[PDB]
Structure formats: structure tokens, C-alpha cells
Amino acid sequence: SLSEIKHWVFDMDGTLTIAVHDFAAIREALSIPAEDDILTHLAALPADESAAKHAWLLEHERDLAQGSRPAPGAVELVRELAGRGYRLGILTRNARELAHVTLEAIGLADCFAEADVLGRDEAPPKPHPGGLLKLAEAWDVSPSRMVMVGDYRFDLDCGRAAGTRTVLVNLPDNPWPELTDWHARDCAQLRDLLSA
Amino acid sequence: SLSEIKHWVFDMDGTLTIAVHDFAAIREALSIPAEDDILTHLAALPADESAAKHAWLLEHERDLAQGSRPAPGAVELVRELAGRGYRLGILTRNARELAHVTLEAIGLADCFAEADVLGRDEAPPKPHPGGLLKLAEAWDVSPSRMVMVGDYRFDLDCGRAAGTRTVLVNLPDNPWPELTDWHARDCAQLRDLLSA
Ligand SMILES: [Mg+2]
Ligand SMILES: [Mg+2]
């Protein structure tokens, strides 16, 4: 079961943190009334208008970005696992130094050994298994007793290639059933799953 | 009128070109049926599910990107203006070298003098007016007889700061009426407007 896994690895972006965007600039650009939610308002527009506005939003994702925040339930999950004495790692395309800064910013830096935060320079790009194998070696543990937690297909492919169990979070359903051992809408539901 | 303007400046990203994304990966990740359009399907989902899936899409905009393509009507507009003997420029945050490559790829490199394609190293970031003032100087023309064409607020602010007329394209309405002299849903409608 999930609770028997005592070695956990997380993707960073999209899993533990998510990008936040400039709501006021979006509302202004897309002519959203103050009384309306942005997405709800867009879904209710005529199809062609909704499509043009959604396209503009995606096109300007980086222009509109304002750093990142912890994903729902992420801090709570990591603290729960750390409280158990579990061993926790990170596998990210980010430079280790940025990953470190991010961990400090969200108050989780003390839950991961610095050597177990693997960035751009410490491991090949997902879905290559190198990074998970590096942690498996450092921890001297069977990959079958580790879990890779992510929100994107290359996270699941990476776990499957290395032989770890896999978890999908931050999508509401199960789009890759063969690649995914457990799925949860977010880290808060994952914590609940773990508990049960 | 618009047709009296013989000096035109364009933003690049979002105006002449737009990012394209991996439709098959999106469909797989978001569980979209083959018979459905991605956006139409998402708008029809329960609110919470639609929101989670739209959030994931925005979060992975760069992961899903597959270069860029010309924006609707952009090639046709630029060729029409060049055919008139009009003077055309680019003001972009992109490195000039990338802008050049992009122009070559979309078959428009011959419509702009190389010196009039202004990139990262040739002009300060929008909305600073430096870049438009640089073109105005090179062309020896009143900014009031130039137009800046863009799809984002900093393009309009840049034109207003330099004193050029401004055009909004690639949004379907008029969100910044005081900043915008003419607006069109895209470059094809702008060409039509120009003609009329
Ligand atoms: Mg990710
Ligand atoms: Mg732009």
C-alpha cells in the first residue's frame, strides 16, 4: 500500500508549486466584470470570443506570470511525510539553486536533504530514469519501494523507467491509467489517501 | 485615416506569430474525446473539473509548446503593406537574431530592412518608447504618422509614450479604448479595415 512507501520523490513545478498570474491584468485584457470569475465568465461567452480570449491567455502565460506559490495541500503533505521520518527527494529540470530558493520560500527546505534535491546539473532530463536511480542508490532502496509524484506525463514515464511506483496529482481524473499507480486531485487528497 | 500611415511597426510574438502547442498531448492529458474540440469540451465540463484542466494547461504552456506559426492574416497584411512601398519595422523583446530566423521561417524577411528589426539589444523593453523613437529617427518621420501594432498592453503603452498611433490585434474587442486608435480581431481584419 501507499503508506508502506517510506521514500518519496516529487517533481517541483506543477507538483509542489504552481505558477501564479496577474489576475488584474487578465481581467482588464479580457474585459471580465469584477463580479465574475475569469474562467466562468470565459466559458459563458460565445464560442469564438471564448476561444480567442483563451488563446491570448495561453499565448501570454509568461508575460502574466508572477512567480509561484505552493500547490494546494503540498506543504501539508510534505510536512506529514517528514513528520513520519520518511526520506524525501526532488527531481526537477530547475537548477538546484533555484529549487533551493523555492523550497526556502515555501517553508519546506528542512524536509529534504540538500543532496537529495536533484536539479538540472545532477540528473538527466525526465523521462530518463537517471535521477530516480541516483536517489535509489543514495538511499540504497529498491525502486519498487519508492514513489515518484508528479503532474505531467514525463514524471510518470520517469518513474516507470526507473521502476518506482508513481502518483499523479493536480489533475482531477486518471488519464494515464497504465502509468499511474495512485492518482489524486491534489496533494491534500493524496495525504487523505495515504491516511486511509 | 489608417491608409495614410506609411510607416508601420509590429510586435513579433502574439502579433505576427503565435505559439503553437501539442494538441495530441493536451488531448491525452485532459481526456478529450477525438470527436470533441479541446476548448469546447472543457467549457462543457463541470466547473471544478474545467478549472483544474484549464489551470494545468496554463501551467504547462511551455512544456506543450512546439514553436510558433504566423498569426491569422499576418503574412497577408505584411505583404500588402510591403507591396504598397510602405516602411515596416519590428520592435520585440526577442534577440534580433531570433527575430530574423523567425521572419525567414514565415517568409517575410524581405519585407523589413534588417536595421529596422529591433530586438533585445537594439532598444529598451516596452513600454519604454526608445525603440519606436529609434525607428522614427531612422525614418525621419513624425511619430504621429507611424503606427505600432500589437496584442498586449505594453505595445499600446509604448506607442502612446512615443507618440505613434496604435492598433490592437488578436483580441476580439476593445479593452483599452483610450490606448487604442484602431482595433481588429486579427491582421486579416486589419487589412480589411485598411482597405475600406
Ligand atoms: Mg511538472
Ligand atoms: Mg506580444
Three cell numbers written together for B12: 513579433
Cβ-based contacts of A172 with chain B (< 8 Å): 48-49, 52-53
For residue B163, give how far its alpha carbon lies from the nearest alpha carbon of chain A (Å). 22
**Residue B99 backbone phi and psi in degrees, to 5:** -55, -45
Three cell numbers written together for A76: 501539508
**A99 C-alpha vs ligand 1 centroid, how far in Å?**
13
Report the DSSP beta bridge partners of residue A148: A9, A166
Cβ-based contacts of B184 with chain A (< 8 Å): none
Cβ-based contacts of A153 with chain B (< 8 Å): 25, 28-29
What is the β-pairing status of strands A65-70 and A182-183?
A: unpaired
Q: Do A18 and B59 touch (CB under 8 A)?
A: yes
Give the span between the Cα atoms of B196 and B93, in whole angstroms: 32
List residues forming the annotated binding site of A. Answer: 11, 13, 151, 155
Q: Which of A142, A151, A4, A27 is nearest to A86 (CA)?
A: A4
CA B96 to chain centre: 16
Give the span between the Cα atoms of A3 and A191, in whole angstroms: 10
**B77 C-alpha vs ligand 2 centroid, how far in Å?**
17
CB proximity list for B136: less than 8 A, separation 6 or greater: B142, B143, B146, B162, B164
Give the span between the Cα atoms of A107 and A73, in whole angstroms: 13
Experimental method: X-ray
Q: Which of B172, B183, B40 is nearest to A31 (CA)?
A: B172
Number of residues that make up chain A: 196
Contact B48, B161 (CB under 8 A): no
For residue A55, give how far its alpha carbon lies from the nearest alpha carbon of chain B (Å). 9
Report the DSSP beta bridge partners of residue B8: B88, B147
Report the DSSP beta bridge partners of residue B195: none
Half-sphere exposure (CA, 13 Å, Cβ side) for B28?
Answer: 12
Give the span between the Cα atoms of B148 and B142, in whole angstroms: 13
**B171 C-alpha vs ligand 1 centroid, how far in Å?**
30
By Cβ distance, the residue of A21, A52, A63 closest to B172 is: A52
Q: Do B40 and A48 touch (CB under 8 A)?
A: no
For residue A85, give how far its alpha carbon lies from the nearest alpha carbon of chain B (Å). 31
Which string of DSSP letters, residue by residue, matches chain B?
Answer: -GGG--EEEE-TBTTTEEEEE-HHHHHHHTT--TTS-HHHHHHHS-HHHHHHHHHHHHHTHHHHEEEEEEPTTHHHHHHHHHHTT-EEEEE-SS-HHHHHHHHHHTT-GGGS-GGGEE-TTTSPPTTSSHHHHHHHHHHT--GGGEEEEESSHHHHHHHHHHT-EEEE-SSSS-S-GGG-SEE-SSHHHHHHHHH-
Q: Which of B31, B12, B189, B193 is nearest to B117 (CA)?
A: B12
Number of residues that make up chain B: 196
Give the span between the Cα atoms of B106 and B75, in whole angstroms: 8
- Nearest residue of B to residue A14 by CA position? B59
What domains can be seen in chain B, in order of their start residue? Answer: 1-17+70-196 (3.40.50.1000), 18-69 (1.10.260.80)
Q: How far is CA B93 from CA A85, B18, B86, in A?
A: 48, 14, 23
Ligand number nearest CA of A63 is 2
Place of cell 536539479: A119
Give the span between the Cα atoms of B195 and A17, in whole angstroms: 49
Report the DSSP beta bridge partners of residue A88: A8
Give the span between the Cα atoms of A84 and A6, in whole angstroms: 9
Q: To one decimal place, what's the resolution in Å?
A: 2.0
Which string of DSSP letters, residue by residue, matches chain A?
Answer: -GGG--EEEE-TBTTTEEEEE-HHHHHHHTT--TTS-HHHHHHHS-HHHHHHHHHHHHHTHHHHEEEEEEPTTHHHHHHHHHHTT-EEEEE-SS-HHHHHHHHHHTT-GGGS-GGGEE-TTTSPPTTSSHHHHHHHHHHT--GGGEEEEESSHHHHHHHHHHT-EEEE-SSSS-S-GGG-SEE-SSHHHHHHHHH-
Q: Report CA dihedral (A25, A26, A30, A32) to the nearest 10 degrees.
A: -100
Contact B7, B145 (CB under 8 A): yes
CA B171 to chain centre: 10
- Nearest residue of B to residue A54 by CA position? B39
CB proximity list for B61: less than 8 A, separation 6 or greater: A58, A61, A62, B19, B21
Give the span between the Cα atoms of B48 and B51, in whole angstroms: 5
Q: Do A175 and B29 touch (CB under 8 A)?
A: yes
Place of cell 526532488: A90
Give the span between the Cα atoms of A94 and A121, in whole angstroms: 9
Cβ-based contacts of B173 with chain A (< 8 Å): 31, 49
Give the span between the Cα atoms of B157 and A106, in whole angstroms: 35
Give the span between the Cα atoms of B83 and B79, in whole angstroms: 6
Three cell numbers written together for A81: 511525510
Q: Which of A144, A170, A140 is nearest to A10 (CA)?
A: A170
If phi > 0 it is left, if psi is from -120 to 50 it is alpha, else beta; for residue B14 that is left
For residue A21, give how far its alpha carbon lies from the nearest alpha carbon of chain B (Å). 10
What is the β-pairing status of strands B17-21 and A146-150?
A: unpaired
CB proximity list for B79: less than 8 A, separation 6 or greater: B108, B111
Contact A165, A5 (CB under 8 A): yes
By Cβ distance, the residue of A29, A54, A61 closest to B153 is: A29
Give the span between the Cα atoms of A26 and A68, in whole angstroms: 17
How many other CB atoms are there within 10 angstroms of residue B2's CB atom?
A: 16
Report the DSSP beta bridge partners of residue A69: A18
Cβ-based contacts of B152 with chain A (< 8 Å): 29, 60, 63
Give, in degrees to the nearest 5, the angle at Cα A189 between A188 and A191: 65
